[PDB]
Structure 1
Amino acid sequence: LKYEEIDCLINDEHTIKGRREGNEVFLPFTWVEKYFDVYGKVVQYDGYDRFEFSHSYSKVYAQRAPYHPDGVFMSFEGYNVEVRDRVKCISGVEGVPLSTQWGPQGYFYPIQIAQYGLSHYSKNLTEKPPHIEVYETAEDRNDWTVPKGCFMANVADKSRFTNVKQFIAPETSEGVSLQLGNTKDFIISFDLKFLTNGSVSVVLETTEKNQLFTIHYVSNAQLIAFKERDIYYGIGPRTSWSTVTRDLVTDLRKGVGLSNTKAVKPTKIMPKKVVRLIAKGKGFLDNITISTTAHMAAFFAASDWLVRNQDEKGGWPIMVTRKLGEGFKSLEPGWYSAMAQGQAISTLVRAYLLTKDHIFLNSALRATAPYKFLSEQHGVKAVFMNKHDWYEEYPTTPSSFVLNGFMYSLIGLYDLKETAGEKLGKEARSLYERGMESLKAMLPLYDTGSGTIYDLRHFMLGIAPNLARWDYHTTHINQLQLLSTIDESPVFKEFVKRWKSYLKGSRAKHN
């Protein structure tokens, strides 16, 4: 195959090496990939090599049905919140993500918590039912080890209509130990009440050279800690009955990856066997279980967190500073987010539809309040050019007009208005209608002709556009694809189609 090397001058400033066969010139992908910011690689199949080029690796969610409030939440069946490195851990006390997106301290960010919930809710609807192995009920329907100094016994508990295992072990002892031996499933679950302080510990055989790591759930409020091969999580007093549910995969990886930075250090470590459970102090223990997944317990932990942490104004105040960029006043702690409000509402509505417990709906109804107040009056409302109401992901001065957060704020209002009924849904209905009018009018401002912009800070600050990376662009499409199944407006379908095409390299026509 006869070819000639040829110098290839690039915009009169750099020379790269190409190849030539008569008139056809061939450019190295090393250059193409960097210069155009595109993707490809050689893929080896049985008796066929093929280079495979992509404009992006991000992919649009394959919607299977029109959206409905009790169904999967957009594309979140495929999200995995807990592996994100901005999640420092799943809180021992609250059973939800503690995030570190903006500083290393670790704070409850409501969005991450709602997305934890929504993603698990969605996986509950799409994944295969979990295998559930029961190790201890305490009934009449063993392999505990009680060393000297310790006692164990089955006892009635009238308070909760069951039999229960009581244990007494001092902290100087080896504790009382239940052999488990699960090779496949790593979500451990048990009912727990402590009389005195103590610990429930889980020993794991890992893939790090066959070593045993132990995860201690201790009855204090201690921040996550990691020494050698011991991981410590504070689960609070548990001096009343509650179900503890812990993903040993996540809990192991977050412990070994413990960092003083805003990102968990990557680790490959996996548990390969849940060896045994170790009880110390004085207390009670029931329903000891290992499951493939515990999606509804994750969903409810998020739901209950939202109910308990909503403030008197119906907001989830965000208790860290956020500096959105030069030009934007810094957001002082206690700011609200339209994305938080909406995602929370979408979570609470789902909790209500499952349980019929009006505590969930009552929280969702209150959560519209911040939508009514401008950013400078402790709300999330912004007005674009004295004409279009908007609900801000970041209620900055000047206004920021972030697209994706806004669309989640609307999906929440849709969820609520479809669920509250005509009377009580009035406020949600009205905020939604106004918001969808704004969105239809303003969508074109986010369209570059070969991508989307993330926000309107170019217009509001007089600077370069803050273009959306491909994964945010895909989110825009997923959002509009969703809206397009609950609102029959042609504009949503047109924009979805064009925005999809951008992902495969299509451009708007030039003149």
Structure 2
Amino acid sequence: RYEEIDCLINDDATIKGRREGSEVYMPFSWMEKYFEVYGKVVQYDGYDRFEFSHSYSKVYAQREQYHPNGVFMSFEGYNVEVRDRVKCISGVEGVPLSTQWGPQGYFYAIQIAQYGLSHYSKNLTERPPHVEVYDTAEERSAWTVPKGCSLTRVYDKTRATSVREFSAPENSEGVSLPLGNTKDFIISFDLKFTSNGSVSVILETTEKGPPFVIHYVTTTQLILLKDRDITYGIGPRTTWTTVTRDLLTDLRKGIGLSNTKAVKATKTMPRRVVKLVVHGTGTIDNITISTTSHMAAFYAASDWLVRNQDERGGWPIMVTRKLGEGFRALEPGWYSAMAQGQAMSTLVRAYLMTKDDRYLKAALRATGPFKLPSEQHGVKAVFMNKYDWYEEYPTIPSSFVLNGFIYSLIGLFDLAQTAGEKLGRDAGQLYSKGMESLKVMLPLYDTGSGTIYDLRHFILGTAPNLARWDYHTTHINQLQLLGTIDNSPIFRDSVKRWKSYLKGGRAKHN
């Protein structure tokens, strides 16, 4: 005798429930939206279970105390390049290009840094990649050489082993080397062009029909799509470099090419790296395909940061940013505490890896914007005349975004610990001060059931800007990290309570 029963919701709408004796059952289709909760029917052998969740995303399981040369917080599980705000990985720079606030496309230091840190972290946690090297057998030849082209083993005196000298007119089919990899999709080759040309990779995919071809060309063009040809300019390449490309990413970013702020999603996947094809004149060597190539990405990010830091020690964001109603628009050229800090964390790791002082010097200079107020090309805000804050968005009036601030602090900590007592005193001073403000202000972000993203409600006198669940777990990840390098009860206590919110826990009411 389950019977249908009408359910009046807050004296407004009516939904259809079920009743069995004294028990009333309410439909999840209503619950999902009403409570903003989550549910899935999951299959088992001969039965299904319904799996309910109060929240989404998960808190990172720390394995040890945080240290500057180790994994960066939870970034071992963070895929930066896959997101639709990354238009592509530049062929010239080898780092992500952003479209998040301009469809124009711009290099954004936060993305570039996070690209570095995530690959850095994954290098520490993953099994080693499988690696296949091609064209490495006794004389002579695996290459296909059409009429009018040439491919010769030659000796470059600046190098230890022979290389391959190629010649193929642009209108010819080019010289080609069979690859045939069906498992791994990170390609690298050492390259030196003596003319305009291209290295093309032929890629069979899950899309029925002809393969896709990705053309890496000697121009500064960013990205192009025409039918099944995707083009990336990689610059002149007239001195020896190692080119490393993630074909999975390069393929999908080409497929999803869009005039909008977001790359179109695709389910298309690569199935076989068929062969490589070269047009022009020059030399090539060490043609390899690997499961992953994390450290190369890390160094590309680290080197981009060094080259693009300005005289003030900052990485200027050259797009206008309007944080919302009540906040003055930020004109191009603004700095971000988060950008500065994430860059420090990347550069410190690069320094510790190489002892190349250009990395340390860049990091030390990055402290510059932290010393100036927001209206003076800086990043410093003051909460109610007492507490220094390093702004993710240096707005007028101040905005006090939590996650970006803590990222700035982790950057300062990396730097202070690495530069040592004399050189790292400025960073260590900025850090200790920021940490004071953090410990004091942290309760202002706690709703009793989740967290708030910024202090917009108090600064503007408006509704709280509540943090979505993935920012909530980010907040937790950040505090548990800090909890390993600072023994204050507030970090362990906040983490414990903030974790309970993920399972529908709440602060007590009176």
By the TM > 0.5 criterion, same fold? yes
Q: Tell me the TM-score range normalised by the shorter chain.
A: over 0.9
Stretches of structure 2 lacking an aligned partner (at least 5 in a row)? none
Question: Structure 2 CA distance, aligned partners of 1:372 and 1:307?
Answer: 20
Distance change (3 Å), C-alpha of 1:294 and 1:139: farther
User: 1:154: which partner in 2?
Assistant: 153
In the alignment of these two chains, the number of paired residues is: 510
Q: Is the 8 A contact 2:479 2:495 kept in 1?
A: yes
- Deviation at residue 57 of structure 1 after TM alignment: 2.0
Identify the residue that residue 195 of structure 1 maps to in structure 2.
Answer: 194
Q: Report the alpha carbon displacement of residue 136 of structure 1 after superposing the two structures with TM.
A: 3.3
Contact 1:138 1:154 in 2 (8 A): no
Contact in 2 for aligned 1:307/1:363 (Cα 8 Å): yes
Match of 1:4 in 2: 3
Contact between 1:137 and 1:288, CA under 8 Å: does it hold in 2? no
Query: How big is the shift at 1:140?
Result: 6.7
Quote the residue 1:59 is aligned against: 58
Contact 1:138 1:163 in 2 (8 A): no
Is 2:229 the counterpart of 1:230?
A: yes
Mapped to 1, the partners of 2:85 and 2:212 lie a distance apart of 23
- Deviating more after overlay: 20-29 vs 138-147: 138-147
Look up the match of 2:405. Answer: 406
Contact preservation (8 Å) 1:55, 1:505 = yes
Matches within 5 A, 1:107-506: 107-136=106-135, 142-506=141-505
Q: Distance in 2 between the 1:137 and 1:380 partners?
A: 53
- SS across alignment from 1:474: helix
Give unpaired runs (5+ residues) of structure 1.
Answer: none
Q: Distance in 2 between matches of 1:142 and 1:97?
A: 37
Question: Could you list the per-position Cα deviations for residues 149-198 of structure 1 after superposition, in whole angstroms to 9, with x for gaps in the alignment?
Answer: 11121222123333211111110100110111011110000011111111
Q: Kindly tell me: are residues 508 and 151 of structure 1, through their superposed partners in 2, closer, same or farther at Cα, counting changes over 3 Å? A: same
Q: CA deviation at 1:48?
A: 3.6
Q: In structure 2, what residue type is equivalent to 1:186?
A: F
Displacement after TM superposition at 1:137 (Å): 5.5
Instruction: Give the residue type in structure 1 aligned to 2:407.
Output: Y
- How far apart are 1:503 and its partner, in Å? 0.9
CA distance in 1, matches of 2:371, 2:16: 60
Q: Measure, in 2, the Cα distance between the counterparts of 1:338 and 1:466.
A: 20
Match of 1:69 in 2: 68
Secondary structure of residue in 2 paired with 1:143: coil
* Equivalent position SS for 1:422: helix
Q: Does the aligned pair in 2 maintain the 1:139–1:163 contact within 8 Å?
A: no
CA displacement 1:1-60 (0-9 Å, x = unmatched)? x21211100011100000112221111111111100000122221134221110012110
Q: Counterpart of 1:86?
A: 85
Give the Cα–Cα distance (whole angstroms) in 1 for the partners of residues 457 and 62 of structure 2. 33
Farther off after superposition, 21-30 or 440-449:
21-30
Distance 1:38 1:140 in 2: 65
Q: Tell me the distance in 1 between the aligned counterparts of 2:357 and 2:504.
A: 48
Between the two proteins, what is the percent identity of the paired residues?
81
Q: Alignment partner of 2:162: what SS? A: strand
TM-score (norm 2): 0.98
User: Is the alpha carbon distance of 1:74 and 1:106 closer, same or farther for their aligned partners in structure 2, counting shifts above 3 Å?
Assistant: same
AA aligned to 2:439 is K
Distance 1:388 1:156 in 2: 64
What amino acid sits opposite 2:324 in the alignment? G
CA distance in 2, matches of 1:465, 1:263: 28
State the Cα distance separating 1:139 from its structure 2 match.
7.9
Aligned to 2:195, the other structure's residue is in SS state: strand
- Distance in structure 2 (CA, Å) of the matches to 1:44 and 1:273: 32
Give the secondary structure class of the aligned counterpart of 2:409: helix
The amino acid of 2:56's aligned partner reads Y
Deviates more, 1:120-129 or 1:21-30: 21-30
Q: Deviations over 1:382-430 (max 9, x none)?
A: 0000101000000010001000000000000111111111110100100
SS class of match (2:119): helix
CA contact (8 A) 1:206 1:272 kept: yes
Other structure's SS at 1:144 match = coil
1:338-397 CA-to-partner distances (Å, cap 9, x unmatched) read 000000000000001111111111111111111111111111110000101000000010
- Secondary structure, aligned partner of 1:72: coil
Q: 1:140, 1:110 → 2: CA distance?
A: 46
- Tell me, in whole angstroms, the C-alpha distance in 1 between the residues paired with 2:295 and 2:478: 24
In structure 1, how many angstroms separate the alpha carbons of the residues matched to 2:135 and 2:186?
A: 15
**Alpha-carbon distance in 2 for matches of 1:137, 1:308:** 35
Q: 8 Å contact 1:136–1:289 — kept in the other structure?
A: no
From the superposition, tell whether residues 461 and 190 of structure 1 become closer, same or farther in structure 2 (CA, over 3 Å): same
CA contact (8 A) 2:135 2:142 kept: no
Task: Show CA shifts across 1:188-246 (max 9, x none).
Answer: 00011111111000001111015311000000011200000000001011111111000
Instruction: Give the Cα–Cα distance (whole angstroms) in 2 for the partners of residues 445 and 349 of structure 1.
Output: 32
Q: Which one-letter code corresponds to 2:43 in the other structure?
A: Q
Checking the alignment, whether the CA contact within 8 Å between 1:336 and 1:395 is kept in structure 2 is yes
Q: CA contact under 8 A between 1:137 and 1:286: conserved in structure 2?
A: no
C-alpha distance in 1, partners of 2:137/2:404?
48
Contact 1:137 1:163 in 2 (8 A): no
Give, in angstroms, the shift of residue 142 of structure 1: 2.5
Cα pair distance change 1:42/1:134, threshold 3 Å: same
* Contact residue 137 and residue 164 of structure 1 kept, 8 A: no
Which whole-Å CA distance do the structure 1 matches of 2:121 and 2:150 have between them? Answer: 43
Do residues 50 (structure 1) and 42 (structure 2) align? no
CA distance in 1, matches of 2:307, 2:135: 31
- What are the Cα deviations for residues 231-290 of structure 1, in whole angstroms up to 9, with x where unaligned? 000101111111100001100000011011111111111111101111111111111110
